[PDB]
Paper text:
Nonribosomal peptide synthetases (NRPSs) produce small peptides as secondary metabolites in fungi and bacteria. Tomaymycin is synthesized in Streptomyces and Micrococci by an NRPS consisting of the initiation module TomA and the elongation/termination module TomB. TomB contains a C domain (BC; TomB91–533), an A domain (BA; TomB534–1055), which functions to load the ppant arm of its PCP domain (BPCP; TomB1056–1141) with 4-ethylidene proline, and a reductase domain (BR; TomB1142–1535). The C domain binds two substrate-loaded PCPppant domains—termed the donor and acceptor PCPs—and transfers the growing peptide chain from the donor PCP of the upstream module onto the aminoacyl subunit carried by the acceptor PCP of the same module.
The crystallization construct comprised residues 1 to 533; however, the first 79 residues did not yield resolvable electron density, resulting in crystal structures of only the BC domain (91 to 533) and the preceding 11 amino acids. In neither form was there observable electron density for the first 79 residues. As other canonical C domains, TomB80–533 consists of N-terminal and C-terminal lobes, which adopt a chloramphenicol acetyltransferase fold and are arranged in a V shape. Two crossover elements extend from the C-terminal to the N-terminal lobe: the “floor” loop between β8 and β9 and the “latch” loop between β10 and β11. The catalytic tunnel is at the interface between the two lobes and includes the conserved motif 222HHXXXD227, where H223 is fundamental for catalysis. In both crystal forms, the catalytic tunnel of BC is wide enough to accommodate the ppant arm and their substrates at both the donor and acceptor sites. The tunnel is ~38 Å long with a minimum width of ~1.4 Å at the bottleneck, as measured by CAVER 3.0 (29).
Author numbering:
A (entry chain A): 80 to 427, 433 to 525
B (entry chain B): 80 to 426, 433 to 525
The structure:
């Protein structure tokens, strides 16, 4: 797998083609809300009161060092292109006040519900929120065509570094040795040469051949003709003990934590739908190369995982079947989801639910000897029926549910969450047990 | 002024043309937020824990009795039509929970940010919010084309009444003797016959002739090429004392409270813009006839008020000049705003607005206890800023709705402070020339 190098894309001024991910995203954009909350608008509470003018000047420094934040999109002869502008002030900005968490959440909602223009920009909004005493907060919305979950950490590190440099009178400018998102976009297209792309597509086309199941969850309402794009969230409240045991199960059985969650979630879905086969989408990070680790952009590909469940399999059986499914999918993870879709020709996609695992250390930023936390807003467009979003660090494993309120009332979701965390507790307690001997509630 | 009668529009099934207001609203409709907060998504805290299934059944009863909630819109031969459906379940509904004010505001925000489809519907969203103890809340979003500020009280009275009737096994059905929004729409077109419409348009075309000023407020940011539809709100915090004196000022000088607010706001704007002439829009209620008082719909027309201010006029001068401008404008208030705009051909007309509601429309009685109608704070900032006043039994108060594309909040807080200061001075020195009312 070749290394990403700066200058791969023409540094002459010619506009680079959008990456596989940007192209799929641009196609669907209808000025909807952010599809998901885990990778959406965010904020960080500061243990000082930030100066608004210098914070704004720090933001312009971040735009200079982060080329995707100055990028708009347009078709040029049948090809979508990334048009980079020199204007480091293309940000939707405001200074506002709050006195408590409710007032802060009101400011977050305003930022989170912007519907940014991809043709003209800006693609980023920032609010400098002034709190009581020595408190303040930065609120940020980056359009998902220009970001992913990890981008939030990148943005805040760049912003706090620029803030501090500008305070010391130092300059804040682009790193010419760092690759851009345009370089990564070209690198991705070179990686997916025609033979390598057919090979990876061929894999998923074989795995997902035939009549695929459509997730059949019990709902409070039928799917409406008009989607209203109204997402809810609900924390799992997975007990710390059960969470620690679930992590212990994973390593004891030789599976990653993610493989374990995928298996338990598949069992949960199989029970609730009465369906043997379940499909779970997962957004896999493409940040393998460390040259991507300080770049804002869409460094993700959605990968489809298929599992077959029945209640005579044991916990250990499903863990090991998830290990094989995840292993092969990750081996072909560079297959762009939208080309997988095009190759499969479903009845117009593939997946109606998603599972995500983040390392909680990506939501932790050190600044001036203190630790800061990246917090997500709760509002989203409910792209899927429901998405399980897990985060694990040394301090423990925890999760939340993002759900489509067009289908579910919140107590239904709380009941689902209640069964899922119970199941996960039984998984760790009885790896040898057949699933039918794991009793409900 | 003819009476509104039920059956004015054919009860045969032929689709009535949209009202003047609905037409203007439909033309602009993209998929933007509610333009303003004062007339936007709302909620009411209930002193019991509502039963979700019966509350949903109550909502279907309101749809049956309130025909605009079952209306969608579509052109048919160059004419916008109100297509009424019999589906009393066309509502964006959910049941959700809250344990404190923050969690409730989270449920309000989700309802408030829906972008309802005018061609397909639903045009209404309702959330049955289950709180702690024996407490709950109803959260509601009705599209601007199908409502006005007063509609929220109509909706909630209908809802609580239906809820109780369904509890006692009684039926909840349409009142055939009550006119519909379709009747009002046809009544409005008959009222604005060609001669009567030309007369009212002629009035505003003469009053508003020439090069109109464009509100020139100091902003923190220039007006952006891409509007982001990001509204803020800021409470004015008008002291009870000054608010009472201000009301007392109005009565003593023989002007309505609204007239007094219009004068003080115009003075405030002239000072902040450096402009002698200021235009203020005001949404005027068209619910004169008591036959409209239990109807949900857009019963409003925007009217443009023009005022000339300089600092040698006294408080009493601007009060009496506001009296004449408002009196004449109200006399021609049926002239549809969009037709006034078409007649004037601007390069619309007003960049700011003033509203006065009677807080008795924001207060409803249920089983001996009084309930308050509360507005969300999110909106699309249709105007640079809008001053929203409400006068109830407890006093007079106001808030500012503002465009965050232009203003940071501390700028708006400083404006609200100068406007509140000015209004106190108005009441203290009605004889004084304005140049003797010093800032701060
Ligand atoms: K502070
Ligand atoms: K505030
Ligand atoms: K909740
Ligand atoms: K309750």
């Amino acid at each position: 797998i070749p290394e990403l190098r700066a200058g791969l894309a023409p540094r002459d001024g010619r506009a680079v083609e959008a990456s596989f991910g940007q192209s799929g995203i641009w196609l669907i954009d209808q000025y909807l809300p952010n599809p998901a909350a885990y990778n959406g608008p965010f904020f960080v509470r500061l243990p000082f009161s930030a100066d608004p003018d210098r914070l704004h000047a720090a933001v312009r420094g971040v735009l200079r060092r982060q080329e995707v934040l100055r990028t708009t999109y347009a078709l040029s002869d049948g090809t979508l292109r990334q048009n980079v502008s020199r204007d480091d002030d293309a940000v939707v900005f405001e200074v506002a006040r709050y006195g408590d968490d409710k007032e802060l959440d009101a400011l977050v909602h305003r930022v989170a519900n912007l519907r940014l223009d991809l043709a003209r920009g800006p693609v980023i909004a920032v609010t400098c929120a002034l709190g009581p005493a020595n408190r303040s907060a930065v609120i940020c919305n980056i359009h998902h065509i220009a970001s992913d979950a990890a981008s939030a950490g990148v943005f805040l590190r760049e912003l706090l570094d620029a803030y501090d440099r500008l305070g010391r009178g130092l300059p804040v400018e682009a790193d010419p040795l760092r690759p851009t998102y345009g370089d990564f976009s070209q690198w991705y297209r070179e990686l997916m040469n025609p033979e390598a792309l057919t090979r990876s597509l061929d894999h998923f086309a074989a795995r997902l051949a035939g009549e695929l199941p459509v997730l059949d969850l019990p709902t409070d309402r039928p799917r409406p003709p008009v989607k209203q794009h109204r997402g809810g969230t609900l924390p799992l409240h997975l007990p710390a003990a059960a969470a620690d045991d679930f992590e212990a199960l994973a390593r004891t059985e030789g599976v990653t934590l993610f493989m374990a969650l995928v298996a338990a979630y598949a069992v949960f879905l199989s029970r609730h739908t009465g369906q043997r086969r379940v499909l779970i989408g997962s957004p896999v990070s493409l940040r393998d190369d460390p040259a991507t680790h300080e770049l804002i952009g869409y460094f993700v590909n959605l990968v489809v995982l298929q599992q077959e469940i029945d209640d005579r399999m044991t916990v250990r059986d499903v863990l090991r079947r998830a290990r094989e499914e995840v292993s092969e999918a990750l081996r072909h993870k560079w297959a762009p989801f939208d080309k997988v879709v095009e190759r499969l020709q479903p009845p117009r996609p593939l997946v109606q639910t998603m599972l995500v695992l983040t390392q909680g250390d990506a939501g932790r930023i050190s600044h001036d000897d203190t630790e800061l936390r990246i917090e997500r807003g709760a509002a989203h467009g409910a792209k899927y029926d429901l998405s399980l979003v897990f985060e694990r660090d040394s301090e423990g494993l925890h999760g939340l549910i993002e759900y489509d309120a067009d289908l579910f009332d919140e107590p239904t979701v709380r009941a689902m969450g209640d069964r899922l965390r119970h199941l996960m507790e039984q998984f760790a307690r009885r790896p040898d047990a057949p699933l039918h001997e794991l009793e409900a509630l």
